[PDB]
Amino acid sequence: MSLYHKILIGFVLGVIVGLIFGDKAEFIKPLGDIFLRLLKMIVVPLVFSTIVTGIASMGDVKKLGRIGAKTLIYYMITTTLAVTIGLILANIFKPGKGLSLGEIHEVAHPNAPSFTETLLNMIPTNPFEAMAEGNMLQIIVFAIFFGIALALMGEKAEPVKKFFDSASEVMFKITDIVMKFAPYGVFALMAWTVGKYGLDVLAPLGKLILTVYLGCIIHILIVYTLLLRFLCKINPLRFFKKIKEAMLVAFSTCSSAATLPVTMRVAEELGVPESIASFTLPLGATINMDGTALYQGVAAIFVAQAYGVELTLGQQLTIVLTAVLASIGTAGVPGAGLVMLTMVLTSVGLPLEGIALIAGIDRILDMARTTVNVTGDLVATAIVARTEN
């Protein structure tokens, strides 16, 4: 029985156990927290080693520059589309209508940290400090510099190239060992999640959850489907059938970085060159704002409607933006997007209670956000590979 089927069995059994035992499933959470700890334990060394090896194996920096430019353009386009879809749905469906958490009042212009500060902080002043702090973007930037240096160096870098290639292989092996525990970790995660988030407690926020899930589904089935159909020119159904395991793991785990090994292994099954994937997927594991864009766009409008502050198109745009902007790097960190949105909305002046309302169901939305993020990462990989082959 394939690992995917074991993970699916664990997923469905965990869902059933959570439905039956309800809150009593909390005792099984540690078995899932162990799985999350093991997965997160690999992201940093794996990302660094794989990025350096991938850039070294290409041997030319012009190709890397082309790939980076195309990936950045694709992510900007998909983030814009995700923001558009989120705003459209939050307006068509009004999850915040009727909550009446507070009285209606005018709102001031949002304030967020300067864009230059976010750009400058992407450059580590100490690579080992970035590695220790788990700063994924700084690690990625240092890895890009290191890989470019290795690709240009040639013979003198042979020991470094070989060591980092072997290190990447070892991290992939570690992932292989860890995933033998994947069915039980997914079982525990799903049991805990379903037990905690009963349908009774989700009733007051049913509209918000439905809107977020519908937006994610629309994004996957339209933005990614059309891109695959036309730009990359492959059958979308077969593509999704190929990446079922990655989507399932991302949904269960709620963290793109933890799912990164799964996406990279699945990419091989799609036939994309290893060198291209090694650069695109780890970078997209931090820069992909699709799911975060949808979540934040929906949540800001939900909070505004809960307090009755109808927002003009300009206010809506400048609120979802500067928020996806301030969360550009921290989005990989769990709960960082929620904190950034909280700060932006507090700057807008909305009370904290509305934002704290979403925090209760953050995991339910996180599932969809992570699924969208990994699907977009794989789609970006495929599209970039197509325009190179």
Token duo for residue 20: 């039956």
The token pair at 150 is 């290795």
- Distance CA(320)–CA(311), nearest Å, equals 11
CA distance 119 to 226: 32
Tokens 């990446």 sit at which residue?
243
| Residue pair 90/302 in contact by the 8 Å Cβ criterion | yes
Strands (E), 8-50: none
CA dist., res. 356 & res. 345, Å (int): 11
Resolution of the solved structure (Å): 3.0
The residue type found at 120 is L
Cα separation of 43 and 140, whole Å? 11
Tokens 């990655």, residue?
Answer: 246
Instruction: Quote the tokens at residue 92.
Output: 């068509």
Q: Which fold has domain 3-386?
A: Proton glutamate symport protein (1.10.3860)
Pair 78, 376: CB distance under 8 Å: yes
- How many of the other CB atoms lie within 10 Å of CB of 222? 12
Buried b (16+ CB within 10 A) or exposed e, 306-316: bbebebeeebb
Report whether 370 contacts 291 (CB < 8 A).
Answer: yes
Spatial contact of 324 and 79, defined as CB atoms under 8 Å apart: yes
Q: Is 33 helix (H, G, I), strand (E, B) or coil?
A: helix
Rounded to whole angstroms, the Cα distance separating 324 from 341 reads 8
**Domain ranges within the chain, ordered by starting residue:** 3-386
Take residue 42 and report the two structure tokens written for it: 């690999």
Q: Which long-range contacts (CB under 8 A, 24 or more apart) does 144-150 make?
A: 144/51, 144/55, 146/52, 146/55, 147/51, 147/52, 147/53, 147/54, 147/55, 147/56, 147/64, 148/55, 148/61, 148/64, 150/52, 150/55, 150/56
233 alpha carbon, distance to own chain's centre: 24
List the determination method. Answer: cryo-EM
C-alpha 213/C-alpha 221 separation (Å) is: 12
- Residues 199/19, Cβ–Cβ less than 8 Å: no
For residue 91, what are its two tokens?
Answer: 């307006």
Judge whether 86 and 298 are in contact, CB under 8 Å.
yes
What backbone torsions phi and psi does residue 288 show, to the nearest 5 degrees?
A: -65, 115
Q: Structure tokens of 10?
A: 């664990």
Q: Which residue has the tokens 């009774």?
A: 200
Angle at 217 between CA 214 and CA 221, to 5 degrees: 140
Q: Which two tokens mark 305? A: 């409607």
Q: DSSP states of 162-215 as a string? A: HHHHHHHHHHHHHHHHHHTTHHHHHHHHHHHHHHHS-HHHHGGGHHHHHHHHHH
Task: Report the C-alpha gap between 171 and 150 in whole angstroms.
Answer: 20
- In angstroms, rounded to a whole number, what is the distance separating the alpha carbons of residues 126 and 135? 11
- Provide the residue type at 326 as one letter: A
CA atoms within 13 A on the CB side of 357: 26
Cα 198 to Cα 23: distance, rounded to the nearest angstrom? 8
Instruction: Give just the sign of the alpha carbon dihedral 340, 286, 221, 194.
Output: negative
Measured over all CA atoms, what is the biggest interatomic distance in the chain, rounded to whole angstroms? 69
Q: Which two tokens stand for residue 187?
A: 């079982």
Q: What is d(CA 360, CA 348) in angstroms, rounded to the nearest whole number?
A: 22
Query: Residue 126 gets which letter from DSSP?
Result: -
C-alpha dist (Å) from residue 95 to 115, 296, 301 = 31, 14, 8
Which residue type, as a one-letter code, is found at position 119? L
Whether the Cβ atoms of residue 282 and residue 365 lie closer than 8 Å to each other: no
Helix axes 29-40, 256-270, angle to 10 degrees: 70
DSSP state of 221: I
Q: Tell me the residue length of the chain.
A: 389
Q: How far apart are CA 368 and CA 191, in angstroms?
A: 17
